[PDB]
Amino acid sequence: MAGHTDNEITIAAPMELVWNMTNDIEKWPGLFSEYASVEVLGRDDDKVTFRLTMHPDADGKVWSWVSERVADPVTRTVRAQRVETGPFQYMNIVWEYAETAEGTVMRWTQDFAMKPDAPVDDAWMTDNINRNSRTQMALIRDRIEQAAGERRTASVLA
Ligand SMILES: Cc1cc2cc3c(O)c(O)cc(O)c3cc2c(=O)o1
């Protein structure tokens, strides 16, 4: 409670592949299904600034914003925040990964609060974020597992 989402998925693929594919942001439009577009606007050394544009929501509204993220492959963590807070007081996003017996776990956590005069409340935003997160996590899992299986078939059959 409240303005907090915490979602995870296990992907039956090795850490290197899961990390590389999920952090290849210019290819996000082909991996995720929720974005109309992803544009990388800048990179300092470590920090990547990019614009996301979602497909229309349930009200037909298009959400588009700029975020900055730092992905650190040594700790297998990513931290992101919104460059302009807009309707939010703030939005902080952390992605963590680990190895388990079943493959690579990826966990996505978001912590935020809406501004007093935002067009939607924390509950609406929380519900949307859980719904989209759960769907996208499931889809990314299927695509990466498919990529892993195809790589393995190629390797074993060669
Ligand atoms: C309708 C909708 C809007 C939306 C806006 C976001 C945002 O502005 C961020 O900065 C970060 C996010 O994760 C966001 C997620 C969603 C979402 O799932 O569904």
Swiss-Prot record:
Transmembrane segments: none annotated. SUPFAM superfamilies: Bet v1-like. Disulfide bonds: none annotated. Pfam families: Polyketide_cyc (PF03364). It comes from the Bacteria. InterPro entries: COQ10_START, START-like_dom_sf. To polyketide cyclases. Involved in developmentally regulated synthesis of a compound biosynthetically related to polyketide antibiotics which is essential for spore color in Streptomyces coelicolor. This is Putative polyketide cyclase. It comes from Streptomyces coelicolor (strain ATCC BAA-471 / A3(2) / M145). The lineage of its organism: Bacteria, Bacillati, Actinomycetota, Actinomycetes, Kitasatosporales.
